[PDB]
Design a protein around this ligand. Structure first.
Ligand SMILES: [Zn+2]
Ligand SMILES: [Zn+2]
Lengths: 118, 342, 276, 139, 88, 33, 40
């Protein structure tokens, strides 16, 4: 019958450096900084190249810096065509207002541990 | 078990720090200083953005003006000088994030895309992007080349007060008025760890410069967070201190905490001990409400401390190199049992 | 309009906007309880607990729903979770009242042991003393008193409670053992000033003149910190009394002068009572 | 950038099939959001061109493919597989299809598998409901 | 007083209301907890919450009924009652 | 006003011409062009 | 009462949910395309 309040513990309430003032929370290593910043630089480079190559500026093509297995059998070559240069390059793109759902995958604890003059 | 925790606190003792007293008052601005930034290499100067829209570049060793950077039209809220670039990113509430090329002292880049007023910058120190967030409850990351909002960061409810960036994930340690210190995944765009231990608006998060931790400050509770997992390290003492505007963390583990009540409170960052509580004197003609310490920073070395207050003044605080552990021991180490803050 | 998935969607979007607003929670819980749907309400209040643990009314309303559903083992689980989260004193008091109206006396000692371990003040110890005193097992009550005095004698260095609460505990122990030798003994050991005053009062409750006189003497010195007091001190004495009188005199512009004169006179009187 | 759901019947009885991706091709025929559209030909000399008509999130919300609009596991219509799940579990599992535009966009962006999509998603509960179908056709 | 104490006192009041009135299974795969809840207890809670809501409803209507300084419409006399309560 | 340990600095005038940079544009190759 | 103060801001979640239209603005034209670096 301990299935109630599965996400709340004292290990969130209790400060960890309380028992030990020496408790080392070390800086990340130089190798970890290099790995994480190379990964995020490649990701930001992906998003900059996507948000520049989807522009109508021809001069956005200069500051920018395919085989697909389906279910079991279909080894598929994916060939993006040459679009017509006069047509809308993204005819599916349209101005629209969208309400995105703010889903709750896991219930987040909100932990507040703790008259006449106002 | 609580009695064991209190006894293990009372077993340990805090570290002594040198007492801070004021050394220099700079009275230049025609408005309130809202954020102070200092160059992370040279220590030749520090720039204080103020409500009279004019950032002023003051001098550490002499206290002189050298230049005035007045490209905004609204109140300059945050100023963040780059570490590996000769830039100066100046969030105001013009809805504009302006880049100041410090080899030219000119505006070069204007980051448009914010939906309301902006409150804070956070230059990611080992990449070429800046983290700007404000009243519109969403952090926009900005590639500094293409001026594009690269990664929106969705999930804070109210206006976002102070954003800090780390070189390793959590690469955006942000905090808002919904009392949440969210740790962000810049790749996934999702909050890895939502820290909901504060009660009111967290106006202040400061990076520890020599360990991977962030101190965050609500009213009368300042809490230190280990960013490796998102764990509480120390709940500071901070009883009846007031509304904390800004924090700043020394290299030598001295934590400033400026209150709206004019009070200062220097904290031993390891132990959570409050040792010194100043009273910032107002100017000779101020109102009593203008004692508040709006913003602060340390020196790169940490031996200085700069505060911009709301009495149109800039005060510099330095340690007593003549006091010892037996001369001025600070306040007493006695954790309080009526509070659960210990 | 009796469509419940719509009203549930509306309350859930309202919780998505501001989840901290408690009347929204209480009305959505009572909404799913008016339609006699308690499994939905138990999912709901488990969400309301895991969201806001430090809010009392969500806990107490879930405890009400499990009271009138008469699922007692659930309420055991609910309070043993809620008391693990170092809650307020009202939470533990409600859990003690729960395991009183569930007449299960062997559990309440463990409940008060963990409530000692959560909130150490002597009023909590005297809640546990009052529980065991109303429910009649004198070996267990003096076990509780002895454990309380052992925790006081082990937490002297902690400054966890005042000496006033130490006086509360030891005076309760003494006035309980009058119902006698133990209490006097505790006070004696306790002496090891305010606590001492308690011993005097207690002896008074149950040789007596000297302690009463001595006890009476203590407030006097306090008060001063006047002539009457000095006189009393003198009476109590002798050299010490004289000294006190002198001090008083010293303590005592025209008004000041008068006071000084009075003090001098007092000193003279003392000397006489006792030339150089 | 998720790869599409196209089942074995739309692509056909070939091993090497060349499809054409257009990023942000058209609005999907469920939620009217744009998506990367994949059009191809079943043979090399097919006269019919076959294109994906729903986006990937609308495909995985119904556990259906993007071209023939039938189930990914079973290759049957959505309404009838929901009817079969209602025959099995004695619970009217229906696919709640939207009709307002904002409701279409809202109902596609959320992370859930609506309708009878969760049963046919993993093969374990798929074969569980399959031998329950065999138990029904024994009765 | 305060919201904590007021929640405590309302809990004590509802236990007094019960004093004037007066298993657990799980599946393997789904893991959802089926609790047997007696129908008399279910609709007794339902009738109790509806009775508390209607009791509060009628007492709030009783406070709505009372009208006895200077006002133009109904919201205005409420605001003037608020200012008269501020005047101590 | 604050003591006689503390510098009090009333300053309204810029003590450096605004055309000069703050961070120096460093160049190792001495261009004599 | 048709004019009102601000309760909360238009959140950037609502701007992150909208799909963009490509409107090449007069100021997002490429300019200052070199990031200057400091000494170390
Ligand atoms: Zn769709
Ligand atoms: Zn198909």
């Amino acid at each position: 019958t301990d299935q109630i309040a599965k996400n709340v513990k004292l290990d969130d309430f209790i400060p960890k450096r309380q028992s030990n003032f020496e408790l080392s929370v070390p800086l990340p290593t130089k190798a970890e900084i290099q790995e994480c910043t190379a990964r995020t630089k490649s990701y930001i480079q992906r998003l900059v190249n996507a948000k520049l190559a989807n522009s109508n500026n021809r001069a956005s093509s200069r500051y920018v810096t395919a085989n697909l297995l389906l279910n079991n059998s279909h080894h598929i070559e994916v060939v993006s065509k040459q679009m017509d240069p006069l047509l809308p390059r993204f005819v599916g793109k349209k101005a629209r207002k969208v309400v995105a759902p703010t889903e709750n995958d896991e219930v987040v604890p909100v932990l507040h541990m703790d008259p006449n003059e106002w | 078990l609580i009695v064991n925790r209190y006894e293990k606190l009372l077993s340990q003792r805090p570290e002594w720090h040198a007492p801070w007293k004021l050394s220099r008052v700079i009275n230049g601005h025609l408005g309130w200083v809202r954020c102070v930034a200092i160059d992370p290499v040279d220590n030749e100067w520090f720039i204080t953005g103020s409500n009279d829209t004019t950032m002023k570049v003051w001098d550490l060793a002499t206290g002189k003006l050298k230049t005035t950077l007045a490209g905004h039209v609204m109140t300059v809220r945050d100023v963040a000088v780059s570490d590996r670039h000769p830039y100066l990113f100046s969030v105001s509430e013009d809805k504009t994030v302006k880049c100041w090329d410090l080899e030219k002292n000119q505006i070069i880049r204007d980051y448009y895309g914010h939906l309301s007023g902006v409150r804070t910058v956070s230059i990611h120190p080992t990449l070429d992007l800046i983290a700007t967030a404000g009243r519109d409850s969403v952090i926009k990351l900005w590639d500094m080349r293409t001026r594009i909002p690269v990664i929106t960061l969705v999930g804070h409810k109210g206006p976002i007060n102070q954003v800090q960036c780390t070189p390793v994930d959590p690469q955006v340690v942000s905090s808002s008025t919904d009392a949440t210190v969210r740790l962000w995944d810049v790749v996934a765009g999702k909050t890895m760890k939502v820290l909901t231990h504060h009660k009111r608006s967290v106006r202040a998060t400061a990076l520890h410069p020599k360990e991977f931790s962030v101190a965050s400050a609500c009213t009368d509770d300042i809490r230190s967070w280990g960013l490796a997992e998102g764990s509480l390290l120390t709940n500071f003492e901070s009883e009846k201190t007031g509304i904390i505007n800004t924090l700043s963390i020394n290299q030598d583990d001295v934590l400033f905490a400026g209150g709206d009540n004019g009070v200062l409170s220097f904290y031993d960052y390891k132990s959570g001990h409050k040792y010194q509580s100043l009273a910032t004197r107002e100017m000779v003609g101020s109102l009593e409400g203008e004692r508040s310490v709006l913003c602060s920073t340390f020196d790169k070395t940490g031996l200085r401390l700069i505060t911009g207050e709301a009495d149109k003044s800039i005060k510099i605080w330095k340690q007593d190199e003549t006091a010892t552990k037996e001369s001025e021991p600070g306040l007493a180490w006695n954790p309080n049992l009526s509070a659960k803050r210990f | 309009q009796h469509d419940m998935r719509r009203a549930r969607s509306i309350f859930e979007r309202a919780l998505l906007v501001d989840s901290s607003f408690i009347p929204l929670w209480i009305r959505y819980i009572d909404a799913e309880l008016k339609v006699k749907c308690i499994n939905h309400a138990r999912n709901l209040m488990n969400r309301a607990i895991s969201t806001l643990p430090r809010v009392d009314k969500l806990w107490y309303k879930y405890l009400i729903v499990e009271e009138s559903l008469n699922n007692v083992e659930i309420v055991r689980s609910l309070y043993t979770k809620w008391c693990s989260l170092e809650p307020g004193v009202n939470a533990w008091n409600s859990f003690v009242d729960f395991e009183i109206r569930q007449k299960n006396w062997n559990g309440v000692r463990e409940i008060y042991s963990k409530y000692v371990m959560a909130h150490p003040q002597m009023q909590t110890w005297l809640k546990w003393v009052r529980f065991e005193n109303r429910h009649g097992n004198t070996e267990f009550t003096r076990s509780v008193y002895s454990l309380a005095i052992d925790t006081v004698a082990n937490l002297q260095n902690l400054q966890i409670w005042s000496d006033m609460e130490v006086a509360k505990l030891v005076n309760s122990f003494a006035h309980w053992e009058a119902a006698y030798e133990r209490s006097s003994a505790l006070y004696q050991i306790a002496i090891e000033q305010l606590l001492k005053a308690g011993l005097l009062d207690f002896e008074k409750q149950f040789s007596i003149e000297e302690t009463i006189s001595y006890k009476r003497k203590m407030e006097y010195e306090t008060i001063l910190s006047d002539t009457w007091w000095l006189y009393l001190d003198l009476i109590s004495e002798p050299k010490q009394i004289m000294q006190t009188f002198e001090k008083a005199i010293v303590d005592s512009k025209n008004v000041q002068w008068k006071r000084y004169i009075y003090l001098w006179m007092r000193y003279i009187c003392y000397v006489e009572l006792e030339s150089l | 950038e998720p790869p599409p759901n196209i089942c074995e019947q739309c692509l056909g009885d070939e091993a090497n099939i060349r499809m054409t991706k257009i990023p942000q091709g058209s609005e999907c025929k469920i939620c009217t959001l744009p998506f990367t559209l994949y059009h191809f030909k079943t043979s090399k000399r097919s006269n019919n061109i076959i294109k994906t008509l729903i986006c990937v999130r609308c495909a995985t919300q119904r556990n259906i493919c993007q071209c023939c609009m039938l189930d990914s596991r079973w290759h049957i219509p959505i309404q009838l597989r929901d009817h079969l799940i209602s025959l099995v579990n004695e619970e009217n599992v229906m696919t709640e299809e939207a009709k307002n535009d904002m409701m279409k966009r809202f109902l596609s962006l959320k992370n859930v598998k609506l309708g009878g999509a969760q049963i046919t998603s993993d093969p374990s509960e798929a074969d569980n409901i399959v031998d329950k179908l065999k138990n029904i056709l024994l009765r | 007083i305060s919201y904590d104490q007021l929640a405590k006192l309302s809990y004590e009041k509802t236990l007094r209301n019960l004093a004037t009135q007066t298993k657990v299974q799980k599946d393997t795969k789904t893991g959802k907890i089926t609790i047997a809840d007696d129908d008399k207890l279910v609709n007794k809670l339902a009738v109790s919450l509806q009775s508390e809501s209607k009791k509060r409803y009628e007492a709030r209507k009783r406070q709505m009924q009372n009208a006895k300084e200077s006002f133009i419409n109904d919201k205005n006399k409420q605001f003037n009652e608020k200012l008269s309560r501020e005047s101590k | 006003p604050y003591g006689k340990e503390v510098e009090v600095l009333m300053e309204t005038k810029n003590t450096q011409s605004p055309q000069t940079p703050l961070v120096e544009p460093v160049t190792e190759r001495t261009k004599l062009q | 009462t048709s004019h009102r103060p601000q309760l909360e801001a238009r959140s950037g979640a609502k701007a992150a949910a909208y799909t963009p239209t490509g409107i090449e603005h007069a100021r997002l034209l490429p300019g200052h395309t070199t990031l200057k670096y400091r000494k170390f």
